[PDB]
Amino acid sequence: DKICLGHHAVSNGTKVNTLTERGVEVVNATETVERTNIPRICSKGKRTVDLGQCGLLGTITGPPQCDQFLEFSADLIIERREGSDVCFPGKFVNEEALRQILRESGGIDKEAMGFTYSGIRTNGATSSCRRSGSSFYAEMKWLLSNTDNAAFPQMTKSYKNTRKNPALIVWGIHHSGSTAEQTKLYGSGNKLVTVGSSNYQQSFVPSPGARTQVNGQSGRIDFHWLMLNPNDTVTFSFNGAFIAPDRASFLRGKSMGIQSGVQVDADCEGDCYYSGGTIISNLPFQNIDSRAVGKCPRYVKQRSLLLATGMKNVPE
Amino acid sequence: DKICLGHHAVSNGTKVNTLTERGVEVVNATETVERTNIPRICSKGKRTVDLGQCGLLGTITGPPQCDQFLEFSADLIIERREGSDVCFPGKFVNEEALRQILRESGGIDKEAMGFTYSGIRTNGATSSCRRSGSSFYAEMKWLLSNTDNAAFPQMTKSYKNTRKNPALIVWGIHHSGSTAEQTKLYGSGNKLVTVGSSNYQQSFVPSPGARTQVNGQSGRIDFHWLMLNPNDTVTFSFNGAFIAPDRASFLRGKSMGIQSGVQVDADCEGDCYYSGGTIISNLPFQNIDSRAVGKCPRYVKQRSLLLATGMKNVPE
Amino acid sequence: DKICLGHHAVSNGTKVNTLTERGVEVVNATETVERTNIPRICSKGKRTVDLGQCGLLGTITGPPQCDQFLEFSADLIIERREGSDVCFPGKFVNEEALRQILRESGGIDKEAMGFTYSGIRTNGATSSCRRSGSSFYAEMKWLLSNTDNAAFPQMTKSYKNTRKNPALIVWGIHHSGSTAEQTKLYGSGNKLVTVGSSNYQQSFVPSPGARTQVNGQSGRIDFHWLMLNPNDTVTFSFNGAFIAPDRASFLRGKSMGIQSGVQVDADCEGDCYYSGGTIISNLPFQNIDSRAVGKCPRYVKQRSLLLATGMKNVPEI
Amino acid sequence: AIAGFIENGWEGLIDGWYGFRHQNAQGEGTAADYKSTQSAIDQITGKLNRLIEKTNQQFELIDNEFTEVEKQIGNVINWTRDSITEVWSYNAELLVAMENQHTIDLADSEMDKLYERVKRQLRENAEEDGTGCFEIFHKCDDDCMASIRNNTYDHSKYREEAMQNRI
Amino acid sequence: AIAGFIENGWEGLIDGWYGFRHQNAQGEGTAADYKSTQSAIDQITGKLNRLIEKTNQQFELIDNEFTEVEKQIGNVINWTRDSITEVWSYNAELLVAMENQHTIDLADSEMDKLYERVKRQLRENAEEDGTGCFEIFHKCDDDCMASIRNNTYDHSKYREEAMQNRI
Amino acid sequence: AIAGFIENGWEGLIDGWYGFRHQNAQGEGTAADYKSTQSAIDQITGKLNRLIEKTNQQFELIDNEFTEVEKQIGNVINWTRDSITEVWSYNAELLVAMENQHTIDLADSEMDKLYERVKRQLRENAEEDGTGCFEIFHKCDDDCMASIRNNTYDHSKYREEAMQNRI
Ligand SMILES: *[C@@H]1O[C@H](CO)[C@@H](O)[C@H](O[C@@H]2O[C@H](CO)[C@@H](O)[C@H](O)[C@H]2NC(C)=O)[C@H]1NC(C)=O
Ligand SMILES: *[C@@H]1O[C@H](CO)[C@@H](O[C@@H]2O[C@H](CO)[C@@H](O)[C@H](O)[C@H]2NC(C)=O)[C@H](O)[C@H]1NC(C)=O
Ligand SMILES: *[C@@H]1O[C@H](CO)[C@@H](O[C@@H]2O[C@H](CO)[C@@H](O)[C@H](O)[C@H]2NC(C)=O)[C@H](O)[C@H]1NC(C)=O
Ligand SMILES: *[C@@H]1O[C@H](CO)[C@@H](O)[C@H](O)[C@H]1NC(C)=O
Ligand SMILES: *[C@@H]1O[C@H](CO)[C@@H](O)[C@H](O)[C@H]1NC(C)=O
Ligand SMILES: *[C@@H]1O[C@H](CO)[C@@H](O)[C@H](O)[C@H]1NC(C)=O
Ligand SMILES: *[C@@H]1O[C@H](CO)[C@@H](O)[C@H](O)[C@H]1NC(C)=O
Ligand SMILES: *[C@@H]1O[C@H](CO)[C@@H](O)[C@H](O)[C@H]1NC(C)=O
Ligand SMILES: *[C@@H]1O[C@H](CO)[C@@H](O)[C@H](O)[C@H]1NC(C)=O
Ligand SMILES: *[C@@H]1O[C@H](CO)[C@@H](O)[C@H](O)[C@H]1NC(C)=O
Ligand SMILES: *[C@@H]1O[C@H](CO)[C@@H](O)[C@H](O)[C@H]1NC(C)=O
């Protein structure tokens, strides 16, 4: 008698958008924008460093917060909000670029340079590090001359960078808290530091600080960043205040390290990280955070975009 | 008999682009690229400051031409081509960053620095800046060494930011334009400036020499600026050339600053401006100017794009 | 009788990617992503300067490698890896901005600076820059003290730009290889160079010390530059260790630059170039070089995207 | 005398876009179909509401026109701005061409929906003539033409005379 | 009582997406069309497999949350990031809206091609009812319902009876 | 057994994209159409010409490959360039996928437009088989086959013969 062709329906479906109208009801649709995050870092199968009170930029310099993490290899490097890059107060002159390469550096390897002269006192008494007593960073010397009324000798120390890898050279300049400190801690007179290379050619001069008492001590450290190409030579020609590195830093490889505020979960794996957690979904878009690292869904502003998987729902 | 089905038509339609043919004629289409604008800036509903003959940084520095804007409060900030940031020749360092901050500041809430000086003169009147007689900048204190031919004493001043918003502190360095003038003004000897805060560290050195003549003067005063986080302190250690701030500037809220060469008009109430006029339209695209500010159409290269609103035109 | 309709089909065919399904067979498809290149520069129709050993920035200062390029005029500028910007060791400060300025400049039109000197040696030379045995940058003056181990008097010089175009003015600061070098030349004492104009103000100080040998002398010159607006003036004030300009550099017009390692080909005309060749194609995309410059296809990461030109190739029994 | 949508368009419909034209005892009657027109207009209006929508992301000045900015950052800004302009010029050209194609295909689909609906109402009497019209084998008066214009038409009762005329 | 895809769907068709409903004197029932549902679900699944393709591009952090970047570079970065976000938000909304339009139109295309397949299999021994129903003008039970679902039904079954039944 | 269109296609058609194949007792054979072929190829070439999209925006060289740029701006350039590249790779894959879907749907709809034109042009003088042929009840050779291949065919002169059959 009668036959009929028709299609399935549901009593109540979901609503998707189309090119000509909004709120089109379909039987089934899925989400294309991820909204659910994992509160913890999914680092399973990858080597990680969970760096706490120490910041990432300090892995070269060696603040007491991460003395044990001076030399390591890693696949994922994690910096924390509480992390600090100083013992004695200071800042890097090109802080963001150096951090950017460290997050891409894969870790750190080191090779000693030297500064094997006399008249110099390695410890450099600072009261902001209490691992055993007054000291400066594990990897740097304060060339303070022969205590009081001691002129600083002229030094011309170079490093040849004999390995095939480019060398990361980090050194610094000490801005004392006052003119009296320049006079008695590094001796009287003017202070000049000249740093040469095939491509650097830059001089620095310290000045009396008279700055606020950040972490008790006034003054600042300028951490200066230099890159060497294979077989190049870095030259440190100076007679002024100088923070002498003991070891040059070299890269390891890939990292894509992520700054994060949450605990590390070693039992889950994924590649998208953000400061508030991770994304382990395979949806094309997210509205969780735009500041994603790795093979991550693309950031959009819409809270949710539903992609239809069924056909138009016309209920009976 | 016969029933015929069909559609309307027009005698003269317009042409639109399609995926298979560039020139398909349609019965009706609208424009999606706006070229119409209003010759005047629109301020209805927004507080507008018109900095006629005044640069935006003159609301911080305070040259005579900006005397009415030292504590301006506005939602829309209009800079003029004919205006100037200074009255006595000079340039700001990172002036682009400072304008970017000020154009979004919501206006400037000035608060006294509270600096008290002794052993100097706080006048510094110059013939290039006049208010019915020789004057200097309203917000800057040019500190000279007593009368003439005397050493300038070193002074170390500081200011603490006690408000919830970050404080903007601006100061300058005076390059006398002659070694003889610098030694008459601030006395003989080496000059050194150190300025800093918990997240800021800079030093400056006056540089006498010879320079060209602008507004009859040979010297140049350059200006520098610092942001203080809440509860942070700034120090100013100088051996001369203070160009000291008299008041700290706080940001009132949020604004959108613009550049314009045309008159302001209350009536239109537009949401986006460009130099030379206002763009008031609902279209998704514009071909007026690429340097647009506000929530307004995205710039495209096409002079016009026509979006069909009716069906295709079959002229018979 | 039976009248059958149908469509052209092929025994082989190709495959294309669609929005819904991958690998859909079609009778014919073309490529929209260019993978072919020409390993040479198609410079036909444009004035081209092939800066073999000459770095682009040396075309302002004039090292021996740039002897023939001191007043070059060209529409297309080709840079090469084997060239150098300097002859005496050194570098430009903000060198990338200056290279970007020069690449579109259209060439260089030099005008005499008009600086008259007295009491000094204006004929300084170095063993690293050998035009005829011992020389220095042709277009800049190495200003020494009257004698070795003697004072260099302070001088102020200025230039007024009387042309309608802004002038590009370059000067060097010489950082000596030792305190003796800065004492043997120019004389003892602190040195200072100040440069300014109505909208520009900088101050430079040389810093003697010690450096590794690069291309001979263990010294360095930092090359600084300014743009001078029309009807403005520039004042140079120096006490020594200042390399003065001899001529002001005006820009000629419009050009584009190339960084490449390949032969210049004057018999072919292309639309854009990259380090490995010229890209001549009417396809909207390319997968060969993401940094090609000029008017040419946009780079995509897809090795090949096949755009159907025929219909779906349903096979016949 | 009067052709349908396949052969050509028809000048004369001022109220609406889609409609019906017929030859009968009264002669060359013309009327518009306001329901298919409102459907097409509603879908086009929604399409424009999505396209004619402004963003809420505010942008400020990055560079200056009264004074120049640092040349390297200025050139990076100009390159990024030009690449964004190229992206939006591509997106605008593709959006306008694609949506114009969808608008034209939309109008043709709505014309087809009307045509097919009439065919399904007429059943064995539809007799498509290849010009976008339906030949009615029964003698149809104004009331049945009006019944065709809206959605309430009986294919029965007419079938007997229509098939006697058709066969 | 019985109505097809033209006006309504089937709330009771859970096993399969496309199917046939049989109303006769010889019982009543519903059976799915395996090939049509299998094609539609595999075709949509392929669409999803395209949507979930990963970028395969690792992005490093450029900005810095814990310590701010310079205001000039930070403002250039925020301008670039916001322009990129607007481009991807535009592309995401256009892609989802366009693909939802294609999914709905594609499902309707499958419905129409299956409907036309049935019409061309029945030819002159059946007529459309305008609702999704086909009126069968010969007596038949589930054996031919299965033959239609199996794409095996032939129209050469006492055609003259159906013609007399509809002439 | 010449019924290519619905299922098999014609691998033997040389001169055009669309055509006619004849089963007539005088001798079977194949011929191509040129008007629907020319229309489809003109639209596809129009697509390729639109898709050239040659830019008139000159881009200069910012990143120096001989001497590296400062690392912070270098990474800004790499991030911006990679985001732009991802945008263009997405746009290229989506554009090609859309154009391939529209090219296939266009070509298949062009074959359907020709098929529908033939069915309506033949009025009730032919019956669909459902595999890709029209069963013609009236036998004819050169005038009717040429007229059907063309856009001008008079269905009246064969209407009586076709209506005498089947009944
Ligand atoms: C990222 O930025 C660095 C410099 O800051 C740049 O070297 C990278 O690309 C370089 O591209 C060159 C030509 O395309 C190539 O020869 C060079 O090897 C390559 N750099 C490296 C380390 O391999 C920039 N990345 C990209 C993707 O361009
Ligand atoms: C970036 O592009 C803008 C144009 O959008 C350039 O501004 C132009 O600069 C020239 C310089 O002679 C002026 O004559 C034009 O009037 C300017 N136009 C506008 C709209 O401002 C700007 O110079 C470019 N920046 C760099 C570094 O090249
Ligand atoms: C660029 O935008 C980011 C946010 O998109 C700004 O950083 C945020 O600033 C607000 C207000 O100070 C804070 O509450 C957020 O926690 C910040 N987030 C991050 C990730 O930093 C940033 O300051 C903007 N840059 C500039 C120069 O204004
Ligand atoms: C449909 O209605 C039921 C009624 O209880 C409810 O539980 C269910 O969540 C609803 N689903 C949707 C998608 O609205
Ligand atoms: C919707 O699709 C998902 C698979 O993505 C499936 O698990 C679910 O059962 C479907 N729901 C309906 C109502 O079809
Ligand atoms: C097109 O539609 C708009 C709608 O406002 C109308 O103003 C305009 O006159 C119309 N143009 C034509 C040619 O129909
Ligand atoms: C600043 O410090 C004072 C200390 O008394 C505290 O009361 C105030 O809340 C602080 N303000 C901010 C913004 O942290
Ligand atoms: C396929 O299309 C291209 C278009 O460039 C054409 O050159 C080529 O000959 C075509 N091939 C076939 C087999 O049609
Ligand atoms: C359709 O038009 C006729 C013409 O008068 C009218 O009588 C009938 O009620 C209309 N149908 C509907 C559903 O309004
Ligand atoms: C149709 O196919 C089903 C299996 O899918 C089978 O059970 C049924 O017997 C078949 N009927 C006919 C008439 O072929
Ligand atoms: C009809 O087609 C034939 C080819 O079979 C052609 O020769 C003839 O000119 C055509 N006639 C018309 C009127 O198109």
mmCIF file of N, CA, C and O in Angstrom, chain D residues 43-78:
data_model
loop_
_atom_site.group_PDB
_atom_site.id
_atom_site.type_symbol
_atom_site.label_atom_id
_atom_site.label_comp_id
_atom_site.label_asym_id
_atom_site.label_seq_id
_atom_site.Cartn_x
_atom_site.Cartn_y
_atom_site.Cartn_z
ATOM 1 N N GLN D 43 17.034 34.414 5.301
ATOM 2 C CA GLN D 43 18.339 33.758 5.278
ATOM 3 C C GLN D 43 19.430 34.720 4.812
ATOM 4 O O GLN D 43 20.528 34.745 5.385
ATOM 5 N N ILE D 44 19.130 35.568 3.825
ATOM 6 C CA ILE D 44 20.120 36.543 3.374
ATOM 7 C C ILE D 44 20.381 37.568 4.475
ATOM 8 O O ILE D 44 21.521 37.994 4.687
ATOM 9 N N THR D 45 19.324 38.010 5.157
ATOM 10 C CA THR D 45 19.459 38.970 6.242
ATOM 11 C C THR D 45 20.319 38.401 7.358
ATOM 12 O O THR D 45 21.133 39.117 7.937
ATOM 13 N N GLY D 46 20.106 37.134 7.718
ATOM 14 C CA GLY D 46 20.958 36.517 8.722
ATOM 15 C C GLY D 46 22.403 36.453 8.266
ATOM 16 O O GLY D 46 23.330 36.688 9.050
ATOM 17 N N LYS D 47 22.610 36.140 6.982
ATOM 18 C CA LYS D 47 23.960 36.087 6.433
ATOM 19 C C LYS D 47 24.641 37.445 6.553
ATOM 20 O O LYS D 47 25.799 37.544 6.971
ATOM 21 N N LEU D 48 23.922 38.514 6.200
ATOM 22 C CA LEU D 48 24.478 39.855 6.353
ATOM 23 C C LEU D 48 24.620 40.246 7.815
ATOM 24 O O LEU D 48 25.510 41.024 8.149
ATOM 25 N N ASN D 49 23.722 39.801 8.688
ATOM 26 C CA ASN D 49 23.889 40.119 10.098
ATOM 27 C C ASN D 49 25.192 39.535 10.610
ATOM 28 O O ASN D 49 25.873 40.144 11.443
ATOM 29 N N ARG D 50 25.551 38.340 10.132
ATOM 30 C CA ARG D 50 26.833 37.768 10.526
ATOM 31 C C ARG D 50 27.981 38.532 9.876
ATOM 32 O O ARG D 50 28.993 38.810 10.528
ATOM 33 N N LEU D 51 27.843 38.886 8.596
ATOM 34 C CA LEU D 51 28.914 39.610 7.914
ATOM 35 C C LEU D 51 28.944 41.076 8.328
ATOM 36 O O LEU D 51 30.025 41.641 8.521
ATOM 37 N N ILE D 52 27.780 41.706 8.479
ATOM 38 C CA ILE D 52 27.736 43.115 8.844
ATOM 39 C C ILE D 52 27.693 43.129 10.364
ATOM 40 O O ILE D 52 26.656 43.412 10.975
ATOM 41 N N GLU D 53 28.836 42.843 10.970
ATOM 42 C CA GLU D 53 28.997 42.787 12.412
ATOM 43 C C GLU D 53 30.387 43.333 12.661
ATOM 44 O O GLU D 53 31.340 42.953 11.975
ATOM 45 N N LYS D 54 30.505 44.203 13.651
ATOM 46 C CA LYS D 54 31.781 44.814 13.976
ATOM 47 C C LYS D 54 32.400 44.099 15.168
ATOM 48 O O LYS D 54 31.699 43.540 16.013
ATOM 49 N N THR D 55 33.726 44.144 15.240
ATOM 50 C CA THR D 55 34.404 43.483 16.344
ATOM 51 C C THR D 55 34.399 44.371 17.583
ATOM 52 O O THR D 55 34.075 45.561 17.533
ATOM 53 N N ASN D 56 34.763 43.760 18.710
ATOM 54 C CA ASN D 56 34.917 44.448 19.985
ATOM 55 C C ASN D 56 36.364 44.476 20.461
ATOM 56 O O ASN D 56 36.620 44.859 21.608
ATOM 57 N N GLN D 57 37.317 44.094 19.614
ATOM 58 C CA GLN D 57 38.726 44.125 19.984
ATOM 59 C C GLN D 57 39.251 45.497 19.585
ATOM 60 O O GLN D 57 39.312 45.827 18.396
ATOM 61 N N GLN D 58 39.630 46.289 20.579
ATOM 62 C CA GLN D 58 40.108 47.641 20.351
ATOM 63 C C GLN D 58 41.600 47.620 20.071
ATOM 64 O O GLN D 58 42.364 46.939 20.761
ATOM 65 N N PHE D 59 42.007 48.371 19.050
ATOM 66 C CA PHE D 59 43.407 48.543 18.702
ATOM 67 C C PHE D 59 43.773 50.010 18.870
ATOM 68 O O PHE D 59 42.963 50.896 18.587
ATOM 69 N N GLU D 60 44.989 50.256 19.341
ATOM 70 C CA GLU D 60 45.530 51.591 19.538
ATOM 71 C C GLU D 60 46.648 51.829 18.531
ATOM 72 O O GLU D 60 46.991 50.952 17.733
ATOM 73 N N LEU D 61 47.222 53.029 18.563
ATOM 74 C CA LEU D 61 48.336 53.315 17.673
ATOM 75 C C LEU D 61 49.572 52.570 18.144
ATOM 76 O O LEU D 61 49.846 52.486 19.345
ATOM 77 N N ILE D 62 50.315 52.024 17.189
ATOM 78 C CA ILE D 62 51.599 51.396 17.457
ATOM 79 C C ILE D 62 52.734 52.323 17.048
ATOM 80 O O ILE D 62 53.683 52.526 17.805
ATOM 81 N N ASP D 63 52.646 52.885 15.844
ATOM 82 C CA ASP D 63 53.603 53.850 15.322
ATOM 83 C C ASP D 63 52.939 55.225 15.242
ATOM 84 O O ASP D 63 51.754 55.388 15.544
ATOM 85 N N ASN D 64 53.726 56.218 14.830
ATOM 86 C CA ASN D 64 53.296 57.605 14.718
ATOM 87 C C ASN D 64 53.416 58.100 13.284
ATOM 88 O O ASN D 64 54.239 57.606 12.509
ATOM 89 N N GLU D 65 52.578 59.086 12.944
ATOM 90 C CA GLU D 65 52.699 59.802 11.680
ATOM 91 C C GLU D 65 53.307 61.189 11.843
ATOM 92 O O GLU D 65 53.859 61.720 10.873
ATOM 93 N N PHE D 66 53.221 61.786 13.036
ATOM 94 C CA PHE D 66 53.779 63.118 13.235
ATOM 95 C C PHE D 66 55.290 63.061 13.381
ATOM 96 O O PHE D 66 55.985 64.021 13.033
ATOM 97 N N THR D 67 55.802 61.947 13.893
ATOM 98 C CA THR D 67 57.224 61.719 14.075
ATOM 99 C C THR D 67 57.491 60.270 13.713
ATOM 100 O O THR D 67 56.625 59.409 13.885
ATOM 101 N N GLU D 68 58.685 60.000 13.205
ATOM 102 C CA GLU D 68 58.995 58.634 12.831
ATOM 103 C C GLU D 68 59.401 57.829 14.060
ATOM 104 O O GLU D 68 59.799 58.372 15.094
ATOM 105 N N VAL D 69 59.291 56.513 13.923
ATOM 106 C CA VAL D 69 59.633 55.571 14.975
ATOM 107 C C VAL D 69 60.912 54.869 14.543
ATOM 108 O O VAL D 69 61.394 55.062 13.426
ATOM 109 N N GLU D 70 61.512 54.120 15.474
ATOM 110 C CA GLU D 70 62.761 53.423 15.192
ATOM 111 C C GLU D 70 62.592 52.591 13.925
ATOM 112 O O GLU D 70 61.573 51.927 13.730
ATOM 113 N N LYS D 71 63.584 52.680 13.041
ATOM 114 C CA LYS D 71 63.439 52.129 11.696
ATOM 115 C C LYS D 71 63.254 50.615 11.681
ATOM 116 O O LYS D 71 62.445 50.103 10.900
ATOM 117 N N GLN D 72 63.977 49.873 12.520
ATOM 118 C CA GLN D 72 63.823 48.421 12.471
ATOM 119 C C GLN D 72 62.468 47.987 13.016
ATOM 120 O O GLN D 72 61.777 47.170 12.392
ATOM 121 N N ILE D 73 62.035 48.561 14.142
ATOM 122 C CA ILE D 73 60.721 48.192 14.655
ATOM 123 C C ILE D 73 59.651 48.751 13.735
ATOM 124 O O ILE D 73 58.595 48.141 13.563
ATOM 125 N N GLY D 74 59.892 49.925 13.147
ATOM 126 C CA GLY D 74 58.929 50.481 12.213
ATOM 127 C C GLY D 74 58.723 49.587 11.007
ATOM 128 O O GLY D 74 57.593 49.379 10.562
ATOM 129 N N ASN D 75 59.812 49.031 10.469
ATOM 130 C CA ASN D 75 59.691 48.126 9.332
ATOM 131 C C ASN D 75 59.068 46.797 9.736
ATOM 132 O O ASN D 75 58.322 46.208 8.948
ATOM 133 N N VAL D 76 59.331 46.318 10.955
ATOM 134 C CA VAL D 76 58.664 45.097 11.406
ATOM 135 C C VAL D 76 57.167 45.344 11.553
ATOM 136 O O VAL D 76 56.345 44.496 11.191
ATOM 137 N N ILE D 77 56.796 46.506 12.090
ATOM 138 C CA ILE D 77 55.389 46.868 12.229
ATOM 139 C C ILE D 77 54.736 46.975 10.860
ATOM 140 O O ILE D 77 53.616 46.503 10.659
ATOM 141 N N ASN D 78 55.411 47.619 9.907
ATOM 142 C CA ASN D 78 54.843 47.753 8.569
ATOM 143 C C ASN D 78 54.708 46.403 7.881
ATOM 144 O O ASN D 78 53.715 46.154 7.196
#
